[PDB]
Amino acid sequence: FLXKLXKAXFSXPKXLKXLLXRRXR
């Protein structure tokens, strides 16, 4: 599996999502 969006890569704030994603995680 991958994830919901952070990994999926669906349309939206990819940069922000990726930032908080890796950072927070």
Summarize the structure in words:
- The chain is 44% helix and 0% strand.
- With 25 residues, the protein is mainly alpha-helical.
- It has one domain (1-25).
- The longest helix is centred in the C-terminal third of the chain and has 11 residues, at 14-24.
Helix and strand string, N-terminal first? H
In angstroms, what separates the terminal alpha carbons?
17 Å
Number of domains: 1
Counted beta strands: 0
Structural class: mainly alpha
Sheet-strand content, in percent, reads under 5%
* Principal-axis shape: flat
Number of helices: 1
**Main sheet characteristics:** none
Portion of residues within helices:
40-55%
Give a quick set of tags describing it.
25 residues; flat; antimicrobial protein; structure from cyana 3.98.15; monomeric; Tilapia piscidin 4 alpha
Topology, element by element:
Elements: H1 14-24
Short précis:
This protein is an all-alpha fold. It has one helix at residues 14-24. The longest helix has 11 residues, at 14-24.
